[model samples]
Target: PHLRNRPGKGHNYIDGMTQEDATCKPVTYAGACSSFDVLLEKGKFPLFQSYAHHRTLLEAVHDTIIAKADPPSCDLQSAHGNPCMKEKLVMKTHCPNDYQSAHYLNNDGKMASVKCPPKYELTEDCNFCRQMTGASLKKGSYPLQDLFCQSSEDDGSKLKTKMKGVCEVGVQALKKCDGQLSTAHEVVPFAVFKNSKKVYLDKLDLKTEENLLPDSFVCFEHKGQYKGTMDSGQTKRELKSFDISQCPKIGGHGSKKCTGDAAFCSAYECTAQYANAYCSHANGSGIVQIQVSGVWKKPLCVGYERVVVKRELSAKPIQRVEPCTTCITKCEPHGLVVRSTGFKISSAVACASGVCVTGSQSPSTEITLKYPGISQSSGGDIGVHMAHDDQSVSSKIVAHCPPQDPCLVHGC
Candidate 1:
């Protein structure tokens, strides 16, 4: 019977023409019926027929499962969405290893080379590490990157110097602003000292090329000027407060480059301004020499024990308006002169003391007196006198004189 209960059996039997069915193809029909029963449940078999449809669906389901499986521990961050940069963006904390400069997290969360620290491995604990042979002796799961390779090594340090303290304005800002100080570096405020007023500069961040000030502060004009208020000249203005041009720069990585440290390496010269100035007879007149004595009282020398003395009057240091005592280069250009416009004294004596029997008997001597006339400057006292010895005394007497402390003048 079709409803007969049987264990581990594959068959369907409810036949009336039992003799005809038992024919030449009875074995083949029996095998096909057995296969169908194994494929479908008694009442759950499909009503329609499709070729290879089940096989195709099975293959697709298998492929999807493998592709979406959990990734390896080493590639945990593969789905983190953030990607390593294409360019070699080095991180500040990482050492600069050539092979692994491709991964790092900077302050902006970026940069190169994710090498592990010494004796560390690229295990699950080391997320930032790359896989490679490390500096240590033995190796396991080595770091792919190296530390100590940061952007701060070069351009970063230089920007720090400029932004932190390059000029006078920079130095003074840390304390207080002095005259005309402006500001640069990340738009940091520095001093400018323009028109006798203090203007603070702006700091700049040089991360990108676009981040910088419009122009840099210039210290001096061609020849430097004193750091102070402008007293005279065109476009002159008054400044009541103190100011500086730039923050004193810092130096001393080489005592040079003027980054700061005012006592750093600098140029030096003889402080004394005027060098030796000489006084000589230019053309003619009033310059004469007479040989009336050898020691003024010796033999073979014309004698003049009784001589006449004549003296000329002079004006007083009485001054109303005079050039500045500082330097012509500092004062008004119209007032500067290579030499002072003053009278030059020339005389000849042929006797003892100030008394002399003067004449043109002695050949006109060409004596050169070391006066502080502004002929040349080599940083020396020009007008100062020295002990003298010579064959003739043409009022050009460089003789040792009294310490009258006569007023002296010099040129710039």
Candidate 2:
């Protein structure tokens, strides 16, 4: 029956085989039955009955057994379902004496090792030591030989070599918004003193003191007077308030006092409205010369002098006249004479009798005229005398003619 029950029997003995029998039987001639034989005895057969079907079914069963028996892959899944590991073992091939092993992942999700020669190692302690040393050196807080390092000598030396390169980078990393260190101390110009006088003080001196750290106060008392108000056009007011009497005299005349210090007065000339005043030699000859009305004057502060005026009379006279009268009964030839001082009588004429005379002299002495008198005188009846100097004098000699005058009857 054993011989007949063997495989390839025509009676189909494999169809009636039990799982217990298959379990006890040794598919290998030496020992335990294979997993495929157990499955086949347990009625786990392929659906097809062809040779290709049987071969395919046997291959699938063989693959399943091999997969279950093989070791687990190193590509592990993490708790978040991501591939947590894809590393592979890498070994240095050429270095026999100093062989090294490193594990890394390649870009294609494969394990690889690119570190052929061992790299020089650096540690956190080494970096920290270099940083502290560099900063101390920059700040001059400690000497270089005195600085300590926790790293090995090789690492410390290597990190120190790169110190200069990282200096600016470190500053940028820790820079403040205003680009100034918060803990830095500063020293600035406070005040300038000459002999017993405070000559100068910076405008920011008081302001800086207020904003400085505690116990850093710098006090300077303001001793001088303010020269002027901040309001515009107050310069005139300030000038008026200045005591010009204190200014040095130049030829007994004092200058208009300047508003600021002696140095300022020496530097600038007084305004044009102040008569172009100027300060001369503030150090030595301290004098002031003012230009007034286009001439430089020294002692006269008011610039000019005053005097009294006199009135003059005119030389030419307005008019001159003379009159004479005679009776016709006793009428003789009336005589007239005209003279001028400081002038010449150029011509003299009688209107009634047509009598005339002339004189040629710079200051003419006299001009004589004779004429028969008429009862009524019209113009120049006796004589009219004209001087060469544009002056004139007139004389009239009148005689009353009777209606029966003997001269009229005789045509005199």
Candidate 3:
């Protein structure tokens, strides 16, 4: 009856003299009980709870999909009857306290010194709460065990991300797939947005040694193509679509980790992406400048524009945005040349966040934008231009040249 609260104390979920399969000698799944589903059974509560056919059967099917199917004999679907995840597997959601984050347990009289949230009391909740005390928090060792098992692997592999869960194809075991997108995945689809819209990444620019499509997506390869597609040889394929054009991406809570934000706190460069635990604010290129004394110079400035990772559209309609506008980096490899790409008026789509920028030109002083070349995107024009200034001196004069009308907020 108290099984649901069993993990609240220092007890293993499958402990005690209930059966020979739980432990004592830790026998491998002799015939049925395989892997993490040692106690799962098929059908109905009590019986299904410990039967091998229960959830394990579904997990096994998920595993099979991973092993086989190159392109798949079945249709590639966004939704399926069964998830492509493993059986008895752990997911980031199972981490117990990442998204919903906090939980309280008081079963069998166990307690922790930190205190519990409402609905949780010592004796009333734990099996041995009355006997436990703040100093003896270890008395609830079982609760800790449950938390640890949520993501930890037994074979000495590193733990998956703090928000643990099953990783899609290529990720053998989920290694912290907490929305931080990277080239780490070769399986499954991108994390769906809160609105159920999937982040749509175009054919990844696969770098081939000989212009041939590779078995997997890779960066920096130039001469080859992938079995599915080819790689980017030039400064090609900059932006990847995600959550559509109008999603409230205040960024994940980890945004504070952004190197730029941490260094520029209180400075005008305090970007919204650098706010929380989700440091998902991308880092690529932008405009760069040189500052002399305190003056902002333009001719001495540059744009690190590459891979349009962010938006250049304004939120207010009619409020114009100068696209391809942010200065590109200083030079390639090290930085981008001055204004490799310039901004023009944006179209129907609204700019996400717009800011008037000024460049500096002081020897020994420098400035740069992050991930420039946005809005120089397709459907829009890349060969757009605006006002120009001196590159040798740092002046506060940032000339505002309005974009062609029909373009609102940011008149280029």
Candidate 4:
């Protein structure tokens, strides 16, 4: 029978309601209205025109078109059962909140639990008690944003990634549900991911009651700063200064003081030549020169004097070692000699053999022998020694030359 066509006539029915109940509020339109809207449309009828808060036609009666077969046990404590009903069982499609089995009343008074047919499963907050409320099955429970739906192996251990959303709660059997989110520890409000990579945020709130986040985060709101106003065409600026009155003034140039750094001549005679000629105010305008100039014609910003001084010194070798030397002698190879008998020879041997007899001999042979060492002695003779680790052969030479004058005769 068409519910809209009949106004409480033949086969008067409204599933959860009866014939007498239908008569007071007969279905008069093809479209259904919220229970409150129906009351407003039909005016006040003490016995019948009443509507509960948030109640629509779907709440007041059954949906015949979408009905399915389910066990009668699910309704034993289903959510939709009226408070006043004699049996007061869950509306043949669900169970009590604390029911050990946690069954839901599917269509046709059938019982379903975590083992719900085809699509049903616990919504995020671990609550599957949808049939207990007047709201839609999906809306009646918590939103899908928690891991309560993750598959488990009792005692809270095994979480199967393959069998997501389906879990055995209490005594309920394994159910069919959102298998995609099984591997995730918690559900993102509305996020999309591909192979653990975030594809899009999908309107997920970064900071929510469920999400762990700080109380407030620093951020730029319409600008790079949190608190600021629109520019009124004025540039922001800051300036600071110390007491300028203490600065020395220009002696004769009254009022034209040394607004910049100044130097003294150190003498009244050379004041014009030694004192700086440039006034800091000429280039800096109103700015005062904080740098004090020394006694120079102009300010010299010489930060380091050693840098130039050391550069000039670097042009010469910084370290030098003079080898020790001495006037020493060796047996003469050539003698410087001349005889009165007209015999002359440079060889000392020739002077020794001598037909003209050894004439006057050369002065004591002295050759400057350089010794690689520092002075070991102070007086007439000195010794310099040098030592090294790998040296195998050692040498020592002594000089024993006679006095400085040439020999007058070799006992001719």
Candidate 5:
């Protein structure tokens, strides 16, 4: 029961309300349906929201799936009836977001704090009350995508190699029962990880109540994303954009014009560029032109009135696709470096190094975005899929948390 199947008896593809193209219309504050699709694509449900209005899922949920389960020692793993395998949890899977964790700071810039404990909850046993909801157990609630073990203090994090090391979310486990899982801080939605790799840098979700997202999120929708009718019969992917705001924004980084590598940084300066390419490197500027899909491309330095931008985080390294433009790239990486100095295109634009650069662009689309709804409001009913406690399930209710390792037999 992969999340793709969560819409039991619904469509074969994960659904959404955005256009076929990527639209930054909704800022982090918008929590527009596009954001939900992003989260869903990363494997998380909209459980909570912040007053500032930003979509947040378990950063861990997105980071964990394909991550090294090498949590710092002395952390809580067995608060429930069972404990982690004595051998230790080795990270075997990798995801796009975790690559950001692979960055090596300059002069010990302090890896963001890996704030352990309650703040970032691991999926513990949820059987306490799942039985009431007719829940039994989940195959296994894996740690969300979050951690990408820094590859080397010197070599830099090659997210490509790390992604190859994607920890299997135990897809096998998902095959057992509910192909879903979450953390104990279910209501909190998700936790962020940045700065010192300690606390979450973005807003997290909390499943306190169904559709109970923060007011910060604005409502939004997309249209004209896709049209099935065609003539030549040459069906190729096209760029599409959608709206994700209640009204236009006024202030903040990249507000007037998206500058930072991260479009919704809310505190942007100017578009970062490398070599001849234009991008937001999220922070610093680097030199590198990228090869995306099949062609070489760059971000369009053009700042528009209603255009939105973002870090195209993904499971694989991505290149920026100048929006509303044709076959043209703005930024590009310098050829092989001479002195091994500064971040090059391969360094800055490459998601392989686990480097959270200012760019990550994907083929834009609104036709079938995975998730929908501007607000991070839980849309459908959360019925108990599985439950177990008292050596079995006890009581679970709607939107209630489920067991951590329902598929213990498989060592989830």
Candidate 6:
């Protein structure tokens, strides 16, 4: 009498038999479903009347859906597969101080050191960093424009070429986070190579420094004082007395005074021709003619000799009689000198092979004007004694005279 499909009745209970099957079947149910729903559904039917059968069936459907659907994962993907669920969700962020970010995402989303190119190093306290207060980086912090590298030598051309490539790579990386790096990134601010040394720009002040070319120099002229004397002698004759009044009284009124002193004709006359004889002492003589009863007669004095005198004179005059002396100034081959401050003499040997040897930093260095082959007569040749380092350099010797009295031979 009772139920036909009761427990242990062998009434062909196929309905629940299939449900009670114990063999776990392969998960064949493929569908798009969430992993959460799959897992929730997988354990729900485990305690059914046909526990094994329902558990197997439920696991098969949920497992199939789970296998088909992706698991809960971070938006980012690992190299191997989907990112781990435990990984924190982090959005790509700009690196600190405009540094280039890494390709792989970090847990904290912060780039610790600068990723420099080959042969580069992360430099701190660089010129660029010193310029900006925020550029300083902490440990494990992002690096900025302070990264630097050098060429094999101190060649500016080589350094420039290498730096350009490095900048290009850095700029490309920087563009990922910062859009402002598009322009003028090639003008690297912090790094510089000068005087064969690689250094940052920190505290480095740039100014217009120059090396002066050698200046054209001049020499002086020397002249000797003058000394000499002049001497001369002279001789002449003079008539002692003339008795021409007695003869000339015939023509003038003053004849009376001449007649008393010359009652007798007294005359000084030349021995030969009276006019021509006055030039010589022997030709000049005193003559007297006695006047007898108002008529003159040549009687008392015939030829009395007159005295002749000779005189000597001397003269002295100042004159330049010596030849002019020339002063010669010589210049040696010398390099340009630094005109700007903050420099020092670079070499000890001031002259090299007759050329003035100057140094790179020699600001106070002076070139001496030497007279290697000058004579003692040319000692007074005056010119500039020394020259500053910045003047034009030369290896040849130059000779000159004073500006007022330039020497034509030397073209001074």
- Candidate 2 off by > 4 Å: 1-297, 300-344, 353-363, 369-383, 388-412
Determine which window of 10 residues in candidate 3 has minimal summed lDDT. 299-308
Which portions of model 3 miss their true places by more than 4 Å?
1-35, 38-412
Per-residue C-alpha lDDT of model 1 across residues 13-56, encoded as one tens digit per residue: 11111222222111121222221222234422221011111111
**Root-mean-square deviation per candidate:** 46.3, 55.6, 32.8, 39.3, 38.8, 66.3
What C-alpha lDDT values do all the predictions have? 0.21, 0.23, 0.22, 0.22, 0.21, 0.22
Query: Model 3, 171: alpha-carbon shift in Å?
Result: 20
In Å, residue 50's CA in model 4 sits off its true spot by: 22
Best by lDDT: 2
* Deviation in Å, model 4, residue 67 alpha carbon: 2.9
TM-score per candidate, in order? 0.13, 0.16, 0.13, 0.15, 0.18, 0.11
265-364 per-residue lDDT for model 2 (tens digits): 4433333342312222212111122232233322100000011111122334364643322112122333344433444455544344653443343345
By TM-score, the best candidate is: 5
Residue 233's lDDT within candidate 2 is 37
Number of colliding residue pairs in each model: 75, 0, 108, 13, 102, 17
Q: What TM value does model 5 have?
A: 0.18
Predicted structure 4: lDDT: 0.22
Output the better candidate (3/4) by TM-score. Answer: 4
